Amino acid sequence: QWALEDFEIGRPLGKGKFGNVYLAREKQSKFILALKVLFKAQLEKAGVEHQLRREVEIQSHLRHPNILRLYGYFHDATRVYLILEYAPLGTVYRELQKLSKFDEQRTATYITELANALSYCHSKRVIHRDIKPENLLLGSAGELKIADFGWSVHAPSSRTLDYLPPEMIEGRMHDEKVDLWSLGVLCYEFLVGKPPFEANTYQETYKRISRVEFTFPDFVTEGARDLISRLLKHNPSQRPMLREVLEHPWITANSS
Numbered sequence: 001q002w003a004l005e006d007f008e009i010g011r012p013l014g015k016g017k018f019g020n021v022y023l024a025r026e027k028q029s030k031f032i033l034a035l036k037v038l039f040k041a042q043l044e045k046a047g048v049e050h051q052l053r054r055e056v057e058i059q060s061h062l063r064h065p066n067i068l069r070l071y072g073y074f075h076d077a078t079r080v081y082l083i084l085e086y087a088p089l090g091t092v093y094r095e096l097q098k099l100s101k102f103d104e105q106r107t108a109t110y111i112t113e114l115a116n117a118l119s120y121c122h123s124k125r126v127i128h129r130d131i132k133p134e135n136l137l138l139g140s141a142g143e144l145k146i147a148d149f150g151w152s153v154h155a156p157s158s159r160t161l162d163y164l165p166p167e168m169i170e171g172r173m174h175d176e177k178v179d180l181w182s183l184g185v186l187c188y189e190f191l192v193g194k195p196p197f198e199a200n201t202y203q204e205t206y207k208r209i210s211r212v213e214f215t216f217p218d219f220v221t222e223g224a225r226d227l228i229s230r231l232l233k234h235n236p237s238q239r240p241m242l243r244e245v246l247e248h249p250w251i252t253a254n255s256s
């Protein structure tokens with residue numbers, strides 16, 4: 001039975017959705033971890049307790065080198081506390097704005113690691129549906145880790161905009177092919193420095209996503225163009241399997 005008294009709190013890592021994440025050390029063992037603090041009142045108001053419950057259930061039970069481990073949880077009067085694996089090298093989000101854009105080797109490596117992780121998730125009937133750079137963390141060896149499971153629905157079939165597929169914004173039926181779409185958007189954003197449907201406006205981004213209207217800058221190689229164009233199909237059925245993505249020649253040539 002964990003309590004706040006069991007941990008020494010350190011620097012704030014991030015300022016989060018429903019509260020900050022802190023660096024923490026467990027007192028007995030000196031184990032370094034991340035403490036995600038969520039405010040109950042704000043969870044009530046947003047009405048996302050189910051998604052939190054699913055998140056907790058999913059992340060505690062899944063075991064993958066490219067998925068951030070969840071060790072446990074506890075609460076008090078005002079807060080819920082998530083006890084998380086600490087990822088030393090931060091978010092791919094910060095990494096992206098620091099480097100501006102990624103080279104093909106770094107990108108294909110990240111895509112490989114994500115595809116492996118999502119392939120595992122999909123085999124356990126878990127669909128992420130909230131994949132984006134700020135939910136992607138880097139471990140001590142720079143290995144990509146899915147940070148959490150977001151505030152999405154995770155069932156095999158269900159019904160910023162930048163990372164959501166056309167079937168999800170149009171209120172249509174959506175499945176595991178959502179994560180393939182997200183993989184296409186990430187691959188584009190990694191190479192270009194911005195997501196393919198980015199706009200100054202929500203209403204415009206919505207239009208871009210629905211029309212699937214994006215263009216490549218000249219420096220995007222044909223192998224990269226081929227994978228991305230395969231992933232960003234309007235019709236989910238047309239999107240490749242994660243298995244095909246892992247075998248794609250551009251991935252093979254460039255991934256570590």
Ligand SMILES: O=C(Nc1cccc(Nc2nccc(Nc3cccc(C(F)(F)F)c3)n2)c1)C1CC1
Nearest residue numbers: 013014015016017021034085086087088089090091
């Ligand atoms: O800042 C550094 N590293 C760093 C920044 C931010 C986060 C981490 N690690 C980490 N490990 C486990 C979990 C998290 N979670 C987390 C990190 C950042 C933001 C949020 C959000 F937005 F959900 F609150 C959650 N972060 C590590 C240091 C320069 C390299």
